[PDB]
Design a protein around this nucleic acid. Structure first.
Lengths: 84, 68
DNA sequence: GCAAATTAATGATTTATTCAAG
DNA sequence: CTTGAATAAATCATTAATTTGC
């Protein structure tokens, strides 16, 4: 019987899937009321607060950009090696 | 019995693994051809085998080791 | 011991995404 | 808004491990 305290919010798999689908529908920089409403809904899956949503979308946008940039340095790896 | 799908020779396997440990995870076309060149000393292999091996390895290590 | 049966691994294909040309 | 570039996720398919009954 015991406690564990978190230093960083982590999305539950359900909160994560919800945020990823908000992203697939085109959400990129939620407004303040958007942040609050999203938060109010995702709190049903578990712990989450407004700044967590705010950061999640910033970090996800940046990481997608960086990911997609580093997919470009590969320079058509799949076609040049697998199809021809 | 003859082969329909490639399978790494036990040495190509250790070399592909070493490359993954030292940071090669999403190799480029060029590098892929470089790697394929080297690994054929140890037997049959083509660029498609190398490209898929890194894709599948990376995906399934994510499955095993990533926490969510 | 040995293969047929069944299960686990993994190679190869397909599908759904992403950013950002145009 | 559309779509080119290029996956990585999900899935399909075949091989290797292994289990099983003899």
């Amino acid at each position: 019987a015991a406690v564990v305290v978190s230093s960083r919010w982590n999305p539950t798999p359900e909160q994560l899937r919800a945020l990823e689908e908000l992203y697939r529908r085109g959400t990129r920089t939620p407004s303040a009321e958007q942040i609050q409403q999203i938060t109010a809904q995702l709190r049903k899956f578990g712990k989450i607060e407004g700044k967590n949503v705010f950061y999640w979308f910033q970090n996800h946008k940046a990481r997608e950009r960086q990911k997609r940039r580093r997919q470009m340095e590969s320079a058509a790896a799949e076609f040049d090696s697998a199809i021809e």
